[PDB]
Ligand SMILES: Cc1cc2nc3c(=O)[nH]c(=O)nc-3n(C[C@H](O)[C@H](O)[C@H](O)COP(=O)(O)O)c2cc1C
Ligand code: SF4
Ligand code: SF4
């Protein structure tokens with residue numbers, strides 16, 4: 003299906019497609035590789051590939067081949083990684099990739115309402131892009147924001163504990179050139195309860211408190 | 218001895234859990250972090266393991282393994298190979314955000330724990346494999362690591378100890394199976410997040426083919442506070458074999474969902490009503506609960522009352538604690554639909570290198586969609602049970618157990634719902 | 647003493663697309679001599 | 691005495707070197723444990739989970755292909771738990787396997803058929819729809835039909851460890867894991883036709899020998915190769931006074947199980 007796991011050459015995605023790293027990306031790559039032992043430099047594949055994705059927005063075959071060439075790895079060892087991990091985009095995506103969580107901790111809290119409100123506001127379907135090439139909607143699994151549900155992820159930022167009105171606001175803002183404030187759209191700032199702090203409303207004790215003697 | 222419910226802030230171990238104080242080094246020192254770590258280090262490693270043991274601290278990753286013994290499988294002489302410590306921060310288990318909260322609001326505790334456990338095991342660095350969706354959290358973590366390297370708490374002379382230690386962060390590219398000790402390591406090594414078998418054991422041959430000990434964020438973040446205040450203090454909380462202050466995450470069909478620290482072996486009903494605002498409609502409207510994460514069997518209202526939220530009680534309740542992510546359902550739920558979505562999640566997040574999960578999880582997802590519709594016959598429920606049991610103990614990893622268990626719970630407590638769906642489908646024809 | 651009525655993690659509203667890697671780069675200055683197997687690679 | 695250790699197989703005792711696996715011991719007492727992924731010349735991989743046995747006074751089952759043998763372990767090859775593990779793994783393998791046996795050149799010499807008849811059940815409770823995979827095209831010698839792959843990884847481990855190509859892998863994850871290349875690429879080495887021999891399930895087959903015969907017809911003549919001067923040992927399959935194919939033999943000193951494409 004949409005995730006085919008095969009690659010048939012096209013004019014947009016071929017080995018001759020024009021990818022290359024920037025002189026800054028090369029130094030970041032040098033550092034990354036330095037974060038691993040000297041004999042094991044084929045472990046930088048994931049960070050270098052996500053880096054290329056950041057530079058180019060998505061991942062064409064030439065990108066993987068260049069990553070391999072840089073790290074001196076077989077390109078199939080990179081195709082496998084790219085296909086296995088989902089954060090890696092092998093088709094061009096929109097300016098703002100929207101990943102909606104629809105697992106039960108969020109579903110329970112009316113996530114399909116958000117999925118629909120996005121289906122309508124944007125004029126797309128559950129896995130399509132926009133003609134403007136700005137939005138891209140997909141369904142995904144738990145994003146570690148199960149308590150501030152519902153929630154969605156838009157290009158490395160979370161927007162949590164939201165509602166149709168809030169997502170409508172976010173979309174009206176992204177279509178005006180703004181980047182909203184990541185975080186819950188309700189009163190709470192984080193996983194803290196909504197009613198009020200019920201666990202730690204005291205001040206913290208501070209250094210040397212509770213320390214056992216003989217240490 | 219009894220009534221392990223309440224816990225004072227004097228004894229809470231993750232003080233900036235709600236982002237109320239500065240998460241940088243100023244708040245860490247002002248709250249009790251990076252204090253006396255020099256003496257902790259100049260103390261022997263065997264002493265740190267003695268503390269981890271006399272504290273009863275059991276891992277929070279999802280399996281109840283005692284650390285001290287785990288971290289003591291690694292206190293051997295070196296064979297000319299660098300020893301490592303890999304922190305597990307890839308919390309993809311539905312309902313779990315505690316590690317996110319830690320990472321982003323009190324990371325210096327995690328760093329100090331890396332250092333302490335490293336001196337305990339003989340490590341040379343700490344690889345913090347963090348989820349890839351947590352970019353801001355990883356950035357805060359790297360900021361903290363830079364602050365620590367500048368202050369001299371990690372690096373060449375970590376706090377002035379003659380012990381040299383590095384801390385590396387590593388992003389994951391979004392996979393739930395990379396949360397296993399072994400697939401974590403493969404990812405770090407560059408290969409797919411395909412787990413490896415045991416034996417070998419990470420302590421013998423692990424990351425980069427070297428000795429390794431994987432550990433959860435919470436475990437390591439707690440280790441220095443234990444070594445500093447005392448394991449006996451940590452062991453006064455909770456029951457005998459299971460002890461400590463455990464983070465909790467209460468999600469779904471609850472009015473005030475939240476994250477909290479409490480005494481283990483706490484009554485679940487209290488844990489909900491006191492900290493959260495109770496289920497939306499009232500305890501009477503509670504259909505069922507998942508005590509731990511999605512990898513834990515359901516339990517219905519009947520036993521949810523007198524149940525203690527720890528390992529052993531939940532085992533005796535035909536379920537498990539896991540990561541302590543209480544998912545609550547009320548009577549307005551197609552529970553079959555929730556469990557089917559869980560099975561679909563496990564279907565997507567399977568790696569695919571061992572036959573049982575690969576095939577049977579998609580099998581069970583199809584069967585579960587059918588049960589949702591009701592197109593099935595009630596003679597297929599036992600077939601599904603047998604399939605689950607064929608998957609359970611025949612896999613390389615636990616994700617097969619995690620995909621098989623919620624089905625067993627559903628069928629062990631909500632069979633009549635399935636049969637009634639089948640009856641309605643037969644009438645509709 | 648402090649306020650304890652606000653949120654002190656408001657810096658992640660300013661993270662760029664290249665913050666993590668710039669941080670790792672700046673961090674390399676403090677890193678430690680890495681081990682070495684004795685090879686450039688398994689020679690795959 | 692020389693670091694050997696005593697171990698049992700259904701009571702029968704045998705002394706095995708350390709590091710020896712359960713499978714090798716059960717062999718040392720004449721028992722052959724089922725297999726779909728262990729090949730005796732390739733890196734170990736515990737994928738098929740068909741090698742599962744129970745150890746006396748042990749709750750779960752171990753992979754005999756990868757678990758080393760410990761002292762005093764008794765290995766129950768023909769107990770209820772082992773049988774049921776095998777039956778489950780067969781159910782799983784055949785769930786998504788296509789009804790292609792009468793068009794599969796591997797018919798009559800398929801390990802899946804024989805292991806289903808000898809170790810698995812005789813029924814299917816799969817009431818769902820199977821999957822399908824678009825076949826590759828890796829050259830004029832090896833025909834790829836990947837609806838029949840049981841993802842054993844033998845082709846990959848062979849290409850990497852023995853041929854030295856490292857162009858085959860696994861694309862994707864989950865039930866949609868597609869063994870093969872990610873791009874169109876001819877896998878034409880000089881040790882390529884052996885991937886045919888080590889693929890148990892006809893996914894990889896000889897295009898020349900395609901459809902030409904069935905194993906029971908052939909009469910097998912033990913001969914040698916002459917294209918080279920190595921003296922590779924081969925079996926010559928014939929069918930009514932006609933050479934149908936060339937198939938290797940075993941000679942641990944020369945051609946353990948391999949032959950060149952020029953030879954076959
Ligand atoms: C599919 C799967 C996912 C897992 N995910 C996590 C996870 O997100 N976080 C975690 O700490 N442990 C996770 N574990 C458990 C691992 O074994 C973990 O690395 C280990 O238990 C951590 O050690 P500790 O529990 O002693 O702290 C997972 C296990 C499996 C099989
Ligand atoms: S159970 Fe699933 S995720 Fe775990 S090793 Fe097997 S195929 Fe991979
Ligand atoms: S193609 Fe054949 S040899 Fe390769 S993994 Fe599949 S079944 Fe095994």
Ligand code: SF4
Nearest residue numbers: 790791794800891892
């Ligand atoms: S591989 Fe074996 S079981 Fe599968 S179609 Fe061919 S002969 Fe039949």
Ligand code: FES
Nearest residue numbers: 103144145147148
């Ligand atoms: S279920 Fe949606 S963030 Fe966890």
Ligand code: FES
Nearest residue numbers: 737738739741755
């Ligand atoms: S023979 Fe052991 S898993 Fe395949």
